[PDB]
Amino acid sequence: PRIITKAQGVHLWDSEGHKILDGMAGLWCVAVGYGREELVQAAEKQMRELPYYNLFFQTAHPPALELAKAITDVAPEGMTHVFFTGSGSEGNDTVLRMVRHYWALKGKPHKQTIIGRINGGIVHIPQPYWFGEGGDMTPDAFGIWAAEQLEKKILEVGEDNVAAFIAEPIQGAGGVIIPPETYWPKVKEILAKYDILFVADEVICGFGRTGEWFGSDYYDLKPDLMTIAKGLTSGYIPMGGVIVRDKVAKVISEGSGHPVAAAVGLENLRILRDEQIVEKARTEAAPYLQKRLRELQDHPLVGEVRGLGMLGAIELVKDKATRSRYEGKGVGMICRTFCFENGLIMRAVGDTMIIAPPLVISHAEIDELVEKARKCLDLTLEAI
Amino acid sequence: PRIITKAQGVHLWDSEGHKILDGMAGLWCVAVGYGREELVQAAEKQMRELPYYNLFFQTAHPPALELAKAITDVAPEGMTHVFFTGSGSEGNDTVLRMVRHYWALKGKPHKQTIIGRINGGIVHIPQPYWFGEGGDMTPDAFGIWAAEQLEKKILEVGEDNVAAFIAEPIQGAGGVIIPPETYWPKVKEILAKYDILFVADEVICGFGRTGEWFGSDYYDLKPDLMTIAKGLTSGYIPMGGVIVRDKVAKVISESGHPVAAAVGLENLRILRDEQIVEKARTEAAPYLQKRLRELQDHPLVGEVRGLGMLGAIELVKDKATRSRYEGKGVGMICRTFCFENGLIMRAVGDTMIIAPPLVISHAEIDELVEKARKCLDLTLEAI
């Protein structure tokens, strides 16, 4: 366990003066990067004024109402309400209660089952991970097939027994599973046929991570509920939320947020907008990040490099043609260790190395990342 | 009323300069009172060095670890572990899954049912509310009966099918339901007979509210799990948690946001180093309970009850029968007068309730009860 004494921009400094590039932005959290005093001052001002309370007695410009309006401004069309929580985990619980409450109010209490994906009361369908699970199929065909497994499960369970499909636009913690380009159009086509709610888990994809405001923007999804956290405050203060489409909010309405967290969240969103951090990540940072990341495709250890927006993944293989793994050898952990010893935070999911840098990472910092990553891929192979 | 421009000690100031005594401590949470700059500085400091992280990389003295130890320091017995959450509600969600997981890992997956109380997979037993439900029984005899309904319900569901009993030591949001003195002794007798977990809901009672550190302390309860929030940070930043007994944690074994934890750590340090819990018990609570009970002569008041830093006033139409102005919205009338006259009291039905900041002074207690009596006058005159 290394002791950090400073954090600024994309870098940590440990107690030994070693400078570390944080390629995971905290835990997918620190969108604007470390050391933005403005977020400190927003928490300090709100805590010093009136630390807590709402309705009957409130401050002049309550940050939560302004936060919700600002969230709905950058959210997909029709997403008009926001219910705030203390965390992303509390958000995903809140959302699953909302879908079942929604159907109960609609007079359909049998609509109880949540369909989710492997590695993403509850039933599961295959995740759209071509690299590990697609075999010799084309990405396009494996994406259509995986999406088709949602329809099968809806009919197997029974539409009148299904409440909702829940999914991250891109599975984060499961290994930056970027689906084939056929996947989401096919899922939309299936969702169009069935009276079930679609929950977009945007706790990782939300607030700039794909180059759009939300992963739902990236894939033109029209979810009914979106769970958010993390990037919402750039991780400076805990907070989650559920964004709700107008029709759903209308049903739930007939049958909130802490001010200090909301003040951090409002200021974090304002910075992302007024400094065009999201837009510049899409147009300037991500093109450089993805081109330079894939330059590692030549490495003997790298079976694949994938990524879009500010997400990236590097697969560690034993043979490239067959996409096999150094089974049992804990290659991911070994690579991660060398990463930590050479001032680079990547995380390992299996033998997948994943990165999600702060959105403000510069080209020069991207050069530092891919340089340190190749450096540790050599160290890993040599160690094997 | 409406726009608040300054909050200090036990008072809020609106934009026209009216000083309002917050008799509810935010919503049961502002234990140390408003305007404590130490908590601001703790959050500010922790936010600017490193905002967030877990293992592999950590700050020099991670606040969550110290806070766990500080909490267990003041917690009962062998409450050894703390698991942090973002809120009290998340804490209560976590504790219900913790008890069910505990019995799964022990190979008893049928132990699923949670026993709660009315006004507190789920089954309910009567709340120990003598004023509203005891009729003509003595409080002592009503309290025994209410507790005995816990045994009946365990046996009715079947011990093998019950995971846990969950209760606040004193129901807060339900209207400060202070039980008869015989209730918790009889409940402990019952719990001692059956192999179920006991969850004390301490979101409201924790961190000094009863004059002890916890409601479990006041009634010498030995819960297996305790849910906490609110006073833990004095509401300056949201946080919740679950304190776990050693035997539960050992089975469950087989992290909290650093800024929230840094605020909770300094808030706990203040409650201890300035003896705020102790002085509430020995100085503020007796004065408060005394002056509150002087309202019992008011024609509208059917009962004053209270212990520690909790208080309740029952508004009745007829004292002897304990009857209510049915349908006439009396509690809401009274609360509106309170707000207009610089006093925040919550209404639950026709009970007015208070839970002031623990630091409230005798002068401020005088202020509260002068204002309460004025509004009891205004309420009865409007009726």
Give the secondary structure arrangement, pairings included:
2 copies of one chain form a homodimer.
Chain A: E1 2-8, E2 11-14, E3 19-22, H1 25-28, H2 37-49, E4 57-58, H3 63-74, E5 79-85, H4 88-105, E6 113-117, E7 122-125, H5 130-133, H6 139-157, E8 162-167, H7 183-191, E9 197-201, H8 215-218, E10 225-228, E11 240-245, H9 246-253, H10 259-274, H11 277-294, E12 302-308, E13 311-316, H12 331-341, E14 344-345, E15 347-349, E16 352-355, H13 363-383
Parallel strand pairs in A: 3-14, 6-7, 6-8, 8-9, 9-10
Antiparallel strand pairs in A: 1-2, 2-3, 5-11, 10-11, 12-13, 13-16, 15-16
Helix pairs in contact in A: 2-10, 3-10, 6-7, 11-13, 12-13
How is this structure best summarized?
Two copies of one chain form a homodimer. Chain A is of the alpha/beta class and 384 residues long. Chain A folds into two domains: 1-35 and 276-384, Alpha-Beta Complex (Aspartate Aminotransferase, domain 1); 36-275, Aspartate Aminotransferase, domain 2.
